[model samples]
Target: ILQHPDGTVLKQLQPPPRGPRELEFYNMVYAADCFDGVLLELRKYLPKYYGIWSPPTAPNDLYLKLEDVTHKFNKPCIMDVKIGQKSYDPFASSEKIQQQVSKYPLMEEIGFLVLGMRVYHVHSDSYETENQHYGRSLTKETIKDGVSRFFHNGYCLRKDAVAASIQKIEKILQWFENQKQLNFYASSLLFVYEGSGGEVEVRMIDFAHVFPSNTIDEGYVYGLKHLISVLRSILDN
Candidate 1:
């Protein structure tokens, strides 16, 4: 991803012979990024996909890019919450995990939290990173080995800020429901941008794991509902 002087971004598809899966993902995002209806609904929260990139390395490449969402803010506090899993159902492989989620009534499920949030400080005008955010994906095995393995709560923000974050997550969930064409397997990222006045702007990014599906997976709802419950649970306490 190349950050431009004017604050847009140039994202290139990784060079191929890589495999068919990555190419398929690229195509899925390319279509989503271009659709006007998708843009109309998500423009308030996502980077605008302007069109294809022509970086020096891949001048003829038709793969695309977007307006830098990170640039669309003040001293941005970025939170990337990647939702979903690689397999059929995230966290459902274990009976305990499935039961943990199934117990929640839909309304209560909306209130939980996800751990592991890192804050970044960026130069305001240049949109360059000053302080880097930290952490990585915690696999299910890591969580299963010990719940003490829980990463720091990502919602470790001020009360108002944290509430705003939940609202954004809700909005993201609604978007997923509204867009019936796609089912995200994994790598569906949520970008939360904190503006100067504590206002929060969120963009759902990184749709590489997305694929067409005839019907919504109930398991997706189950996992996401539980994740939201985890996020909200952390914030309220």
Candidate 2:
């Protein structure tokens, strides 16, 4: 990933099938002829796409040029939370399914996983990082604490940021309740907030595992509701 001066970011496409699938998903979302109400509404929850690009030096290497969600923040604290009870898609092989389950056994019950996060410590004027290993160690009882930690600086918790994020996430949950167009596996919600109490943003990302489906995405809905409740708990306490 690389940031551009024009308030955009470049994400290199993954190799082979995954890369193509993600591009296809983006194309569908921004298709000029697309009139799907669900997808149209979904565009608001995603990063604004500006088509594909390649560096002159690397002509064959393609990248997705998208709005930089954190561009407006002076001290951005970002967290990547993977949503849904199941991480594997319908086409996942048995081996792949087993591998995903073993990686996070509580995913079914918890409905979400923290991939990584960077939190700004206001007191020290520095940043702290929590990697996948830290997230994998979180249990059902301690998950709230893990999430709460993200909103906490050394001096205090950013309640305003929490409130704003919750409002945005609630909108996403409402969308899921009405839409039955796609099922998302291994998709994540990217949360960003300024450490100086400036702004908060939540966006749905990573669509390589997305698939067309007629039925509602029950697993995703389940996870989103749980996530919202967790955020509410943080706010209340």
**TM-score for each of the candidates:** 0.61, 0.96
Predicted candidate 1 versus true structure: per-residue lDDT over 179-231, tens digit per residue: 66656543444444553433565565555445566776444555566565555
The residue-level lDDT of candidate 1 at 126 comes to 25
The lDDT per prediction is 0.49, 0.90
Q: For model 2, how does the per-residue alpha-carbon lDDT over 1-237 read when each residue is reduced to its tens digit?
A: 799767999888889787778888999998889898988999999999888889979979988888898888888999999999999999889999999999999999999999999999978899999999988999999999999999998888788888899899999988888888899999999999988653799999998889999999999998998888898899886
Which 10 residues in a row give candidate 2 its minimum summed lDDT? 192-201
Shift in Å, residue 100, candidate 1? 23
TM-score of 1: 0.61
- Candidate 2 stretches greater than 4 Å from native: none
> How far is each candidate from the true structure, as Cα RMSD in Å?
8.4, 1.2
Question: Where's the lowest-lDDT run of ten residues in candidate 1?
Answer: 143-152
